[PDB]
C-alpha cells in the first residue's frame, strides 16, 4: 500500500558496469507506472508481451530492475534474441521474456572530460552466456566515454524491468 522505491533505482548516482549488471528486488509496493511512462526522458520504453498502458492495471509476483551503462549503439542488442558481443558475452535476455526495457541518454552525467573509464565490459569469454547470469588477453575492456563522443558512443543508462505475469501471490500491484 506504501509507494514503491522506483526513484532510487532510476535516480541512482552511479549505475553498474554491464559486465556485472546490478539487480534489485522490488516487492511490497504499489508501483505507479504512469509517472515512469509519461516521463519524456526515456528514449525507448519497449514492452515485450505486455501493453505499456495496460501495465498500470496488472499485478505481479516478482519484479526486478537490472541497471547498467552501455554505449548507444548496443541498446538494440538488449532486444531479446539479438546476437552480438554485448549480448552473448555480457547480458543476454531469455528468449521471449515478458518485460519492458527503458533507456535514456546519460551523456549529461556519466561522460567526463578526459574520459571516464569506471565502466567495463567483458572483451573475451570462452562461451556464450545463459539467460540472466553474470560472470566475474585480459578480458575486460574499459569504455572511453568522452563528452564529445558520437551518439552511438555516448553512454545510455538502461533499466530492464523484468516481471512475471502468472497469477501466483502478487505483492507488487498498480492502482
Amino acid at each position: 500500500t506504501n509507494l514503491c522505491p522506483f526513484g532510487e533505482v532510476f535516480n541512482a548516482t552511479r549505475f553498474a558496469s554491464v559486465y556485472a549488471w546490478n539487480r534489485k528486488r522490488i516487492s511490497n509496493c504499489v508501483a505507479d507506472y504512469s509517472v515512469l511512462y509519461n516521463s519524456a526522458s526515456f528514449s525507448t520504453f519497449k514492452c515485450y508481451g505486455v501493453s505499456p498502458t495496460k501495465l498500470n492495471d496488472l499485478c505481479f509476483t516478482n519484479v526486478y530492475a537490472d541497471s547498467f551503462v552501455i554505449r548507444g549503439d548496443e541498446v538494440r542488442q538488449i532486444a531479446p534474441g539479438q546476437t552480438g558481443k554485448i549480448a552473448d558475452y555480457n547480458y543476454k535476455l531469455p528468449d521471449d521474456f515478458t518485460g519492458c526495457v527503458i533507456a535514456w541518454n546519460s551523456n549529461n552525467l556519466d561522460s567526463k572530460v578526459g574520459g571516464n573509464y569506471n565502466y567495463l565490459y567483458r572483451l573475451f569469454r570462452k562461451s556464450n552466456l545463459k539467460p540472466f547470469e553474470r560472470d566475474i588477453y585480459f578480458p575486460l575492456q574499459s569504455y572511453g566515454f568522452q563528452p564529445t563522443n558520437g551518439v552511438g558512443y555516448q553512454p545510455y543508462r538502461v533499466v530492464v524491468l523484468s516481471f512475471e505475469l502468472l497469477h501466483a501471490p502478487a505483492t507488487v500491484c498498480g492502482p
Epitope: 526513484g7 548516482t13 552511479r14 549529461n108 561522460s111 572530460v113 578526459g114
Partner: antibody
C-alpha cells in the same frame, strides 16, 4: 591548493534577492562537481542542489526548486547560486562544497560559511 | 527519498568514555555513507569515507562499521578537543539527505 572561499556576507531587506558566489581554486574545475548545502542557526545541515561544471546539468531539493537556480562560469571556474526572494525564516548560514562524483562521492572541501541576514 | 534518523540528539558523556553513534537509513543504501563533524562555530568536514574506512588524512582513532542499512560510528575516547556534533549523510541516490545531528556534552 584546492580550497573554496565564500564571497562574503550580505545584508538585504526582504524581497531583495541575493545572488551569492563561492570562489573555486586549486583543482581541475570540471573534474569535481560543485554542491551547495544550507543550514540555519539552531539546526543541522540541509542540501540545496547540485550542478555539473562540465555540462551545466543541475539537480535540486524539491523544497527549493523555485527559490534557487544554479549556474557556473567554467572559464573562470566559479559557480553561482541565485535566490529569487527571501523570508525572515530564510536567515541562514550557507556553505559551498566540493562533491567528488566520479571518485569518493564525498563533500570533502567546503567554504568558509556565507551568512544571510534577511531583515525587515 | 531516504530519511536518515540519527540520535540521541545529546550524548552526555564524561571524558575517557568510549562513545558510539548510529545511523539508520529508511531504505537499503548499500554502503555509500559518510560522517561529518562540526566543532564549535566551525564548518563541517569529512571524517569517514564509505562509512567504514577512514579517509587518508584523519587520525586512526576514528573508525566506522556496519553495512547495508545500519551504519555506526564510535570514537575510542572523547576529550574536549573532539567536542562536536556529528551528521550522517548519504550519496547513493538523489536527493541527498543529511542527518539530524547529535551533540556531545559533559
Amino acid at each position: 591548493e584546492v580550497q573554496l572561499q565564500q564571497s562574503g556576507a550580505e545584508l538585504v531587506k526582504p524581497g531583495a534577492s541575493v545572488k551569492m558566489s563561492c570562489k573555486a581554486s586549486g583543482y581541475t574545475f570540471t573534474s569535481y562537481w560543485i554542491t551547495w548545502v544550507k543550514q540555519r542557526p539552531g539546526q543541522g545541515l540541509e542540501w540545496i542542489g547540485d550542478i555539473y561544471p562540465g555540462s551545466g546539468s543541475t539537480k535540486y531539493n524539491e523544497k527549493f526548486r523555485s527559490e534557487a537556480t544554479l549556474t557556473v562560469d567554467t572559464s573562470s571556474t566559479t559557480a553561482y547560486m541565485q535566490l529569487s526572494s527571501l523570508t525572515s525564516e530564510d536567515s541562514a548560514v550557507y556553505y559551498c562544497a566540493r562533491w567528488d562524483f566520479y571518485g569518493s562521492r564525498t563533500f570533502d572541501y567546503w567554504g568558509q560559511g556565507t551568512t544571510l541576514t534577511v531583515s525587515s | 527519498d531516504i530519511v536518515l534518523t540519527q540520535s540521541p540528539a545529546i550524548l552526555s558523556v564524561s571524558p575517557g568514555e568510549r562513545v558510539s553513534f548510529s545511523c539508520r537509513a529508511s531504505q537499503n543504501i548499500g554502503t555509500i555513507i559518510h560522517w561529518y563533524q562540526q566543532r564549535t562555530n566551525g564548518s563541517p568536514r569529512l571524517l569517514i569515507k564509505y562509512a567504514s574506512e577512514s579517509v587518508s588524512g584523519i587520525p586512526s582513532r576514528f573508525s566506522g562499521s556496519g553495512s547495508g542499512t545500519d551504519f555506526t560510528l564510535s570514537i575510542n575516547s572523547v576529550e574536549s578537543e573532539d567536542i562536536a556534533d556529528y551528521y550522517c549523510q548519504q550519496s547513493s541516490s538523489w536527493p541527498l539527505t543529511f542527518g539530524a545531528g547529535t551533540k556531545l556534552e559533559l
